[PDB]
Design an enzyme around this catalytic site. Structure first.
Site, PDB file in Angstrom:
ATOM      1  N   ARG A  78       0.834  -1.190   0.000  1.00 58.38           N
ATOM      2  CA  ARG A  78       0.000   0.000   0.000  1.00 58.38           C
ATOM      3  C   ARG A  78       0.872   1.245   0.000  1.00 58.38           C
ATOM      4  O   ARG A  78       1.978   1.253   0.548  1.00 58.38           O
ATOM      5  CB  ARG A  78      -0.945   0.036   1.211  1.00 58.38           C
ATOM      6  CG  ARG A  78      -0.410  -0.655   2.450  1.00 58.38           C
ATOM      7  CD  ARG A  78      -1.268  -0.329   3.659  1.00 58.38           C
ATOM      8  NE  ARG A  78      -2.638  -0.804   3.497  1.00 58.38           N
ATOM      9  CZ  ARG A  78      -3.699  -0.221   4.043  1.00 58.38           C
ATOM     10  NH1 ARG A  78      -3.553   0.873   4.777  1.00 58.38           N
ATOM     11  NH2 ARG A  78      -4.909  -0.726   3.847  1.00 58.38           N
ATOM     12  N   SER A 147       8.808  -5.618   5.139  1.00 56.88           N
ATOM     13  CA  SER A 147       8.485  -6.782   5.889  1.00 56.88           C
ATOM     14  C   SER A 147       9.354  -7.995   5.806  1.00 56.88           C
ATOM     15  O   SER A 147       8.897  -9.061   6.054  1.00 56.88           O
ATOM     16  CB  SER A 147       7.085  -7.134   5.528  1.00 56.88           C
ATOM     17  OG  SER A 147       6.509  -6.008   4.948  1.00 56.88           O
ATOM     18  N   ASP A 200       8.274  -4.164   9.503  1.00 60.38           N
ATOM     19  CA  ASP A 200       6.886  -3.986   9.580  1.00 60.38           C
ATOM     20  C   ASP A 200       6.395  -4.262  10.965  1.00 60.38           C
ATOM     21  O   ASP A 200       5.310  -3.998  11.246  1.00 60.38           O
ATOM     22  CB  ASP A 200       6.240  -4.808   8.469  1.00 60.38           C
ATOM     23  CG  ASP A 200       5.968  -6.245   8.812  1.00 60.38           C
ATOM     24  OD1 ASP A 200       6.841  -7.055   8.996  1.00 60.38           O
ATOM     25  OD2 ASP A 200       4.817  -6.603   8.760  1.00 60.38           O
TER      26      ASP A 200
HETATM   27  O1  LIG Z   1       4.994 -10.121   8.235  1.00 56.27           O
HETATM   28  C1  LIG Z   1       5.539  -9.999   9.523  1.00 56.27           C
HETATM   29  C2  LIG Z   1       6.894 -10.644   9.555  1.00 56.27           C
HETATM   30  O2  LIG Z   1       6.832 -11.919   8.826  1.00 56.27           O
HETATM   31  C3  LIG Z   1       8.186 -12.554   8.680  1.00 56.27           C
HETATM   32  O3  LIG Z   1       8.075 -13.650   7.881  1.00 56.27           O
HETATM   33  C4  LIG Z   1       9.204 -11.601   8.073  1.00 56.27           C
HETATM   34  O4  LIG Z   1      10.504 -12.221   8.113  1.00 56.27           O
HETATM   35  C5  LIG Z   1       9.266 -10.312   8.804  1.00 56.27           C
HETATM   36  O5  LIG Z   1      10.136  -9.400   8.076  1.00 56.27           O
HETATM   37  C6  LIG Z   1       7.915  -9.682   8.947  1.00 56.27           C
HETATM   38  O6  LIG Z   1       8.029  -8.534   9.791  1.00 56.27           O
END
Ligand SMILES: OC[C@H]1O[C@@H](O)[C@H](O)[C@@H](O)[C@@H]1O
Ligand SMILES: Nc1ncnc2c1ncn2[C@@H]1O[C@H](COP(=O)(O)OP(=O)(O)O)[C@@H](O)[C@H]1O
Ligand SMILES: [Mg+2]
Length: 465
Positions: A78, A147, A200
């Site tokens: 987004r 993320s 994230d």
């Molecule tokens: O989506 C939330 C989390 O999922 C994990 O699989 C990722 O390695 C993280 O970077 C992410 O913050």
């Protein structure tokens, strides 16, 4: 038939390996905290990376100006924009646009991924309306939520460690993620600078504290799972520089990579990891997260459909397809309450390609969903408990004294949209805490709170223009 007792033996070993008695959950939370210590000292072969986010000050509320934010995204991304007013006005205006990530862009070229997200940002700014204002000749600034695991080198720079939850784009591992986005943003004739890059789990925690002063941690439960908290910079042995002014630091645990021998795993987990996009990695996450829950159910149903002819005397072809049963499908079957389970069975028709199902088969299917979701939601609560015990909030003060109010911001579709999963998560957490301590912990829902959270941290880290 005997086919019936054959099916009972399978379900028994499932409820035997998936068994998570509260006693075991306590030991797992204990192991979580030991691994958190390991990662902060940079022990080698640490599962928990415990990454310094360079976020030393969460948002205060005095954020002011116009800032954009980009949020990616295990399944979506987004583009957000907000006009921040100040301590009093706060967020004046706010717009956003979510786009689903095409499946190929998860496994293709990083130029393709960042070109796609930058071209959607391009047309988003170009629609910048009238209640948003950028002072003359200033540059727009971006908060970027990433993320995936990233080794941070500043508030706005970081190296991708590895990919997770579905992605597998060669060539980025080891490269700066902001430099990659920046480039793509240029290839789009776009004048923007990324001033803050954050996981994230870190982003949700920032946006979480903007609306609630007591937010001490953020947990994500979506396509993947992870958590971030605020730590004491003196409690991190690998810090090298000179301590922050606030003496605090937000740590991205990256707890999806947690492994312990106390984790209740089974052959279904071994096969899933073996045929996974990142075998051996993210062990804990592959028992909790939305990407993997339905797949565990499908592999249990497959053992039953074959060793017990549960769906006929010939295994259905569709059931042998990996990831054909998604977690929202699992979710729908699980919440069926009709006396004959007609909506669970109607779902099984689509997913299996069978024509009818017996009422006993539906009940077995419903039990498998229950066992899988329960194990995931309990282990996730045991992880949150570990965080509370790191911050020393697993206990109430013996003064007797006042009670602390500890808020944990939660984000992700599994938690927001899988009802049973959510209530089982919270029940176990309250069970893990005392009745005394549970009255002090708040599980808030901060859906997509990394969007604005990243914009807020971009504000405090402006240029200014
Ligand atoms: O989506 C939330 C989390 O999922 C994990 O699989 C990722 O390695 C993280 O970077 C992410 O913050
Ligand atoms: N109705 C649902 N039931 C169970 N899980 C869901 C449901 N809806 C969405 N999910 C899970 O949430 C994930 C989407 O969450 P989200 O936070 O928005 O994105 P991300 O993919 O970035 O983690 C999906 O991958 C899915 O696994
Ligand atoms: Mg969502």
């Amino acid at each position: 038939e005997e086919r019936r007792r054959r099916a009972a033996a399978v379900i028994e070993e499932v409820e035997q390996r998936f068994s998570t008695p509260t006693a075991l959950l306590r030991g797992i939370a204990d192991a979580m905290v030991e691994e958190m210590e390991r990662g902060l000292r940079a022990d080698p072969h640490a599962p928990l990376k415990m990454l310094i986010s360079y976020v030393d000050n969460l948002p205060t509320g005095d954020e002011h100006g116009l800032f954009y934010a980009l949020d990616l995204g295990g399944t979506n991304f987004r583009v957000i924009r907000v006009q921040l007013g100040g301590r009093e006005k706060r967020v004046v205006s706010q717009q956003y646009e979510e786009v689903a990530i095409p499946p190929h862009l998860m496994v293709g070229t990083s130029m393709e991924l960042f070109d796609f997200i930058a071209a959607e940002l391009e047309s988003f700014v170009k629609t910048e309306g009238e209640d948003f204002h950028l002072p003359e000749g200033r540059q727009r600034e971006l908060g970027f939520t990433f993320s995936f695991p990233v080794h941070q080198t500043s508030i706005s720079s970081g190296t991708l460690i590895k990919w997770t939850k579905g992605f597998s784009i060669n060539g980025t591992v080891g490269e700066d993620v902001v430099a990659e986005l920046s480039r793509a943003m240029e290839r789009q004739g776009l004048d923007m600078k990324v001033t803050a890059l954050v996981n994230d789990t870190v982003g949700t925690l920032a946006g979480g504290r903007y609306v609630d002063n007591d937010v001490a941690a953020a947990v994500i439960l979506g396509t993947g799972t992870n958590a971030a908290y605020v730590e004491h910079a003196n409690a991190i042995p690998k810090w090298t520089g000179l301590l922050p002014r606030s003496g605090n630091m937000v740590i991205n645990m990256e707890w999806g990579n947690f492994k312990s021998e106390r984790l209740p795993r089974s052959d279904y987990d071994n096969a899933l990891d073996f045929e996974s996009l990142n075998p051996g990695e993210q062990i804990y996450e592959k028992m909790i997260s939305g990407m993997y829950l339905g797949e565990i159910v499908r592999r249990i149903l497959l053992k039953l459909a074959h060793d017990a002819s549960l769906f006929g005397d010939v295994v259905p072809t569709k059931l042998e397809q990996r990831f054909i049963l998604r977690t929202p499908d699992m979710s729908a079957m699980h919440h069926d309450t009709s006396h004959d389970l007609k909506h669970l069975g109607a779902k099984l028709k689509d997913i299996l390609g069978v024509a009818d199902t017996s009422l006993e088969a539906r009940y077995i299917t419903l039990h498998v969903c229950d066992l899988v979701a329960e194990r995931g939601a309990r282990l996730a609560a045991a992880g949150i408990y570990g965080i509370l015990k790191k911050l020393g909030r697993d206990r109430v003060p013996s003064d007797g004294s006042q009670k602390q109010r500890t808020v944990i911001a939660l984000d992700g579709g599994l938690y927001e949209h899988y009802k049973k999963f959510r209530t089982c998560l919270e029940a176990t957490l309250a069970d893990l805490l005392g009745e005394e301590a549970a009255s002090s912990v708040v599980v808030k829902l901060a859906n997509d709170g990394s969007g604005i959270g990243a914009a807020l941290l971009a504000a405090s880290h402006s240029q200014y223009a």
